[PDB]
Amino acid sequence: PALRLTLHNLVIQYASQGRYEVAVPLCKQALEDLEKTSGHDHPDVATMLNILALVYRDQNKYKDAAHLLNDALAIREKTLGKDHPAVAATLNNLAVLYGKRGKYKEAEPLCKRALEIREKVLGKFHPDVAKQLSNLALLCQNQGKAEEVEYYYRRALEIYATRLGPDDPNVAKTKNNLASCYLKQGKYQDAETLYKEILTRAHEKEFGSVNGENKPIWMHAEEREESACKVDSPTVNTTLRSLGALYRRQGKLEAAHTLEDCASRSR
Amino acid sequence: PALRLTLHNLVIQYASQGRYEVAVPLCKQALEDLEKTSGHDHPDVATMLNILALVYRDQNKYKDAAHLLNDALAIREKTLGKDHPAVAATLNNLAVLYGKRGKYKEAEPLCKRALEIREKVLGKFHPDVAKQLSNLALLCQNQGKAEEVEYYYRRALEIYATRLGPDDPNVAKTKNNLASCYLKQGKYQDAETLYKEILTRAHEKEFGSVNGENKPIWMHAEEREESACKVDSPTVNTTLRSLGALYRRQGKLEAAHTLEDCASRSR
C-alpha cells in the first residue's frame, strides 16, 4: 500500500493499544474504503476487517464482529488459499467469538481446521499446537463428545508431558481433564490411575527420593482403610476431591473421608 | 528340638544344597518319624514335610509333592493359625506345584489367599506384594482371564512405579506385560500409550532436560511419516519392536522402520 494507506494503518494499531476505541474504529473504516476503491477484494482488506472484528468484540458487538471475520476468512481463502498461516489465526479468532456466545457446535469445525493447518506449518509435535488441542478438546468438554476428547487429550498430554517438564501445570490440568472424560465413559480404573499420577508426581516435587517410609497421600489413604500434607496448589486440591469420589464409589469411605482432610485444610 | 533332631536336620539342608537327593530324603523321613513319636502333630513336622515336598518336586514326583504340602498346610493352619507368614509361603509353594502341572484353576485361590496374608503382614504397598501380584497376573494370563490380569498388573505397576525409581526394570517389564494384555483385548491405543511411556522415560535417562529439539525416538518416527538412538537395553529393544508392529498395523510403515532399524542396530 501507499505510505498514506500504511501510516494511516500504523496509527489504527497505535491508538487501539491504549484501548482508545471509538477513536480507532472510524479510521479503520476510512482505510478499508480507500483499499476497496484502490484494489479489491485483496488480502489487506481482510487484515483490516480482522482488526475491526477484534475492536467490535471488545465493544461486545458480537453479531457484527463475527460477520466481519467470516468475510475476512472468505477473502483469505480465495487469495492466500487453504492451509495458509494467516487463515489459521482467523479461524481461531472466529472460533473464540463463537465460544464466547456458547456456540460450541459451529466452533468445533473451525477449531479442528485451524489445528490441521498448525500441524502442517509447525509439525505434529510443536507446543503452540498442544495449545490447540487442550483448547479444541475443551470445545468438546463442553459438547460432551468424550471419545474424541479422549483422543485429543491423549494427543495433548503426549506433547505437554514430553516437550515440557513433569512439573508443568498443563500436564496436571490435561490429566484432570482426561480423568473426567474417563469417568464419564465409566472407565473408573483409567481415571483412578491418572489421579494417582498427579499426586505421586506432586509428592516428588518437594519430598525428594520418594523413600520407603515416604509414600504419597493416596497410599496412606488406602492403608488407612485398614480399620502432614498442607499443599495450597489449586489443581492438586481438585485432584484430592475428584478421587475422594472414587474411593466413595468403591466403598472405601474412611479413605475418601480422609481425601477432604487436605483439600479443605490447604484452602 | 534335641541337638540330635537339630544336627540331623542341619545336614538335610546341607547335603540337598549340592542337589544330593536320594541321600537327603531318607534322612528327612527318619527325622519326621522321630518328631512324630516325640511330639505330634507340631509345626516342625510341617517344616520337614515342606522340605520333603520340595525334594519330591525336584524328582518330578508331583502327586507325592502336592500331597505333603497339603498336610504341612493343615498342620500350620492348626498350630500357627491362618494369616501366619509361614502359611503364606506354603500356599505359594503349593500354587507353584499346581501351576507346573497346568492346574491353574485350583492354583489361583491358593495364590489369592497368600496375597491377602502378605498384605496383612507387610501392608498393601510393600514391594513383596507386587511380587505376588505379578505371579497372580501370570496365572490369570494362563487361564485367559484378561480383565483380572489387567487388574493385577495395574496393582503391581502401581507399587513398582511409586516405591521404586522410574528407571527400575520391573516398571518396564510390568508395562510390557500389561501392554500385551491390552493387545489381546484389542485395546491398541492403551498398549501404544504404555509403549510410548517406556521409550519416553528411557529417552530421559541419558538425554537430560527433554528439550524442544530433543524429542523421543517415536516422535521422530511419526514426524518422519510426513513424506542417533543406540540403546543396548533388552527390554527397550522389545518395546521398540512392539510399538513398531502397531505402526505397521496403522499403515505408518516409515515410522515402523525407524524404531525397527534402531532395535536391530542396538543388538
From TrEMBL, chains A, B:
<comment type="function">
    <text>Kinesin is a microtubule-associated force-producing protein that play a role in organelle transport.</text>
</comment>
<protein>
    <recommendedName>
        <fullName>Kinesin light chain</fullName>
    </recommendedName>
</protein>
<comment type="similarity">
    <text>Belongs to the kinesin light chain family.</text>
</comment>
<comment type="subunit">
    <text>Oligomeric complex composed of two heavy chains and two light chains.</text>
</comment>
<feature type="repeat" description="TPR">
    <location>
        <begin position="88"/>
        <end position="121"/>
    </location>
</feature>
